[PDB]
Design a protein around this nucleic acid. Sequence first.
RNA 1: CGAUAACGAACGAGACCUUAACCUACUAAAUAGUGGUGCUAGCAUUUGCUGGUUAUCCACUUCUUAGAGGGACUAUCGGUU
RNA 2: GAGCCAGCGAGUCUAACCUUGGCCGAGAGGUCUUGGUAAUCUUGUGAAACUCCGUCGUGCUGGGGAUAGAGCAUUGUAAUUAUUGCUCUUCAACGAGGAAUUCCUAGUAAGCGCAAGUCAUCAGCUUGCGUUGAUUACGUCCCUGCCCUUUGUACACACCG
Lengths: 63, 82, 63, 141, 100, 206, 145, 55, 143
Amino acid sequence: GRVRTKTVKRASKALIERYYPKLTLDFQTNKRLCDEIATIQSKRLRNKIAGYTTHLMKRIQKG
Amino acid sequence: KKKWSKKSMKDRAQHAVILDQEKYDRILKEVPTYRYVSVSVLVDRLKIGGSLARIALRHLEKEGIIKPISKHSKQAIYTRAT
Amino acid sequence: TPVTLAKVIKVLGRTGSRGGVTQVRVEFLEDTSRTIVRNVKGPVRENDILVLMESEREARRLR
Amino acid sequence: AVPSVQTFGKKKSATAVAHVKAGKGLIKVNGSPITLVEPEILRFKVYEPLLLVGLDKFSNIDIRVRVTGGGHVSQVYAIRQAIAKGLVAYHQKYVDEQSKNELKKAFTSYDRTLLIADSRRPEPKKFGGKGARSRFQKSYR
Amino acid sequence: IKIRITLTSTKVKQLENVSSNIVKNAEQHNLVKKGPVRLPTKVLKISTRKTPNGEGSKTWETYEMRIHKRYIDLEAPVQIVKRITQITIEPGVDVEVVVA
Amino acid sequence: FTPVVLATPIPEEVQQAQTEIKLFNKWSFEEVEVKDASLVDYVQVRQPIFVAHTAGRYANKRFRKAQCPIIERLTNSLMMNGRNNGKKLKAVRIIKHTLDIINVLTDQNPIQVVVDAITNTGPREDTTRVGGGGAARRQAVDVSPLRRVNQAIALLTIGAREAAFRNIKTIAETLAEELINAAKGSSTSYAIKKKDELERVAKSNR
Amino acid sequence: SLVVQEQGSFQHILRLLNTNVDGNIKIVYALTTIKGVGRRYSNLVCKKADVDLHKRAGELTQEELERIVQIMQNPTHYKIPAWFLNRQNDITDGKDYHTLANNVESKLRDDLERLKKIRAHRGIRHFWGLRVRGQHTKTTGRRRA
Amino acid sequence: ATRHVLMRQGVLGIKVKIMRDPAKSRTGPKALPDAVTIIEPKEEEPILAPSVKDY
Amino acid sequence: PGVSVRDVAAQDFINAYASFLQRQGKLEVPGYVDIVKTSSGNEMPPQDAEGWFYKRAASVARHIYMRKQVGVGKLNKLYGGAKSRGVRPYKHIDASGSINRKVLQALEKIGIVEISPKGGRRISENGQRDLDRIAAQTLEEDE
RNA sequence: CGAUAACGAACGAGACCUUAACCUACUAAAUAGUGGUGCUAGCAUUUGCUGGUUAUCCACUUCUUAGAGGGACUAUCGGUU
RNA sequence: GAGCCAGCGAGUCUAACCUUGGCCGAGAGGUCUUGGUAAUCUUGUGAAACUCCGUCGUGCUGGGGAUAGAGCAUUGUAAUUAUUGCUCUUCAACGAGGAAUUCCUAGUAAGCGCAAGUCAUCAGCUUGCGUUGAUUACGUCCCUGCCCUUUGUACACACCG
């Protein structure tokens, strides 16, 4: 299935904790700021983290 | 050993492999009113070997009664002329 | 061969002891909105027409 | 100079590269014209795009194709993908986007394979069997 | 003079920094060249059983040795040639030059 | 219509196939409206093709085999029994000859005769197992339209195959006569006999 | 395309060298029906006999058939390459012979009993009815005994 | 590492496995895939007004 | 328009060429024709027994012309094929090098082919002109 | 996901690596190809088509390889929770 | 008879490997040469199945090729209980397989051949490669077994208790 592990979810959680203004709802810019703002040893992992952060930013923007 | 088959005899068909004047004018007058014609049609409906069937197909498409629509090998397809 | 043409509007679920059959809700086309619930062999989903060799039976379940 | 492009069509192992330019309306494949592809039914299969759009779009353009790799039928699919991509490339490069897009719309609405390629790349074989999934046989007694 | 340098190793990044300092040395000295012609990689496969004895499942392992080969063509007079050969000896990579 | 020429000459009949409507070499995929409103949407017309061979990704999803062209499904069913695995070229060859045989006889559209035949030989009610414990029993149920299509094509192909086995009547013509028999409804065709056998056993175990 | 009507010249069966031969079939495979001759030698000797292969067996002439058998019992005279023969460099003469319809089983028994009388391995295997060519005999072939 | 050792009663196998720290690698991956770093953004005192500093 | 073997079809052209050569005088024949199986794998000899040398000749002239340089080895791997090794599974096997050498030497005699350096044979200009010119004659033959 | 006498953790899974696919975007190359020039063969010659040619050179990297890289994260939309 | 298209991969230095070409031989094979330490030459591995034409004819028959007989070559110090190959001849079971049972959900099954491992010679074996390419599901626990929980137990070499 498309479910994701705790490294993804906790990383996404922490980035939205202390970087909510600097990022946004756009998958592309979230990836292109993720690459530098958090050192990640896997490109596929970076993409997964970016996707979940955008999921949570859509949730935050309505409610 | 055991077989699980029966293997009885049959006619051991005597399809012609050469012909005579009776078979010749027979096939000349009887092969029309056969909207579909092929090697197998002549064999099963006229009780002739498949070589005669093929050679007669060449003969009949040369004079012109049977109109081919496909002259592909292993399957020959003819109508009749009208 | 008097048959009945009826259309599945809902699929209830797989039945048979081996998941080999299904339960469906089927609406008669002649005299519409008179429903019935019946069985199917092959793959099927909603809105799907099906011939019935009789109309007046409803097998509930099976093992 | 010349108005010309060079595209391709891939397959299982077959790559068919096609050069297109302004000519006199000729089509060739391995130096042999389009009517000599010779699976003799797949011939119509490779005629299909130009029949869909009509030979009007081939009036003063010459296409020459060269093919390698795999079976006869794989070569055929590679050829038709190559000429479809090359015609759409020619109308991307010099002719207007309207003609290109309606052309490509017809090609895709007929079949996705003429432009996009079959990505079913073959699975390897593993041990334990003759193939990728089929194991040999179990015996107990 | 018409030399050809070639490298025949397996440790990729070693070979690649070798080719890189070679070509930047060559281009800083402003010498003709081709690029690093990267040949097809050759994978040596040895496929055998895991089991020393005969029993267990028939489980096969396939070990591989990946070999990478590169080469460049150069022109330079003999003194700079021999200095270029005696420099850029990085371990793991095997090197050889030929002429004509 | 105008016959347009180019530097490489093309045959004029295929130019005709180009200008009006795509077809076979001869036959017209239109006016093949089927009689069974159940089996429509699980047959495939009004998207014509020249060849009965294409690398359609049909077995990835569930009902993508319904969107496959029906005559392609017939070809795909013909190549089996081991020795004829693969060999789609001989499959489409046998289809070409079979359709020509059907159309020299019964002079309407042989595509029409294959769709009327498959909806004729559709099995409509089947039977299924109930377990029991110690002993198994049956119970008769209804059938999906897609399964009618699949069963009809399987029945027709296998009947023509075993009819063609060990006799002079070639597979093309034996398929054609099986098709026209199933088309009219013959009670002499393998397909119809297996069909009403199954419907009878269903009726019993109703 | 050639069609011609066969009259009483045809015969359903015929005779060649102490062996019945079937008409109503192709001559080359009719010849193969005779023992001591297979498809190769039959086709070869029909070409050397200079006669139609397309024609069947029963509808042939006695001059054709005697010409054929004349070739068959002295082939090397009729310029056959001398490696077609089924007994080349015979043990008793060193000549290249062709054994035929009746002589085949005879000469078979002849060289077999030669091995049997010189007490050779192959001879004793032929005697007991075992396998002679070094086969495995443990597993395969129980349904001959 | 794997080793054999011979006592009078027979052989004893020893094996040793040592996982070093990734961060001290000095060549290769300096980390682990399921380990990531979340660097701190320096918080900023706000504008409090619009204003400009010229060069 | 201009014509070449690649412009004309394959089997009919070889048929027309081999027929032209069988009518065209004295080519060359080995002498062991109507004897041999043309391979090690072919379980029988050919059917057009008086023919089939000319078919082989026409095909090799076409084949060499399409290509640049070939050898009797390449020709054997080309013209042979599957063998039924009885019970044992099929296998590729090479055809009769004597047949291919002899048809090539016949072609060198008539001059269609020409021995070529860097190994092999090659189409001559005489071979080039008469092969292409027979191709021109053949695609107008049907009318 | 959360529920909660449990809190916080570790191994396994996932992550990771290889291989297969995509890149007409970078580095490029007679030990891979492409086009063009000359030399040259054939057919039609009317404009052309099909070829051969490493010392004939000129250019390009789409196909071919490899290096660094990019790309998919279920993106977007609609239901369901 | 013609057409006739792959991919993975292996190769000689103080040795005798892959071997192209041309010449002889029906063929196996021999011969004199060549190229290659390899994207370079073997090799575009011109593979097979396939297609196009004909011959065949429903005939244990041109299906099928065990079984045997004679001869010609190669490998090897040595081939005898035939290494292998080539040629001719002999042409037996086998007419789709009984209770049963195996593998399989996509370029997968299945058909097809190819290289490598073994190797002086010997593939019906294996490991990989590509060529042609389906039908049938998107489910269930009914069979065979697995995982978690609840429950029962006179079980603990643990239900073969």
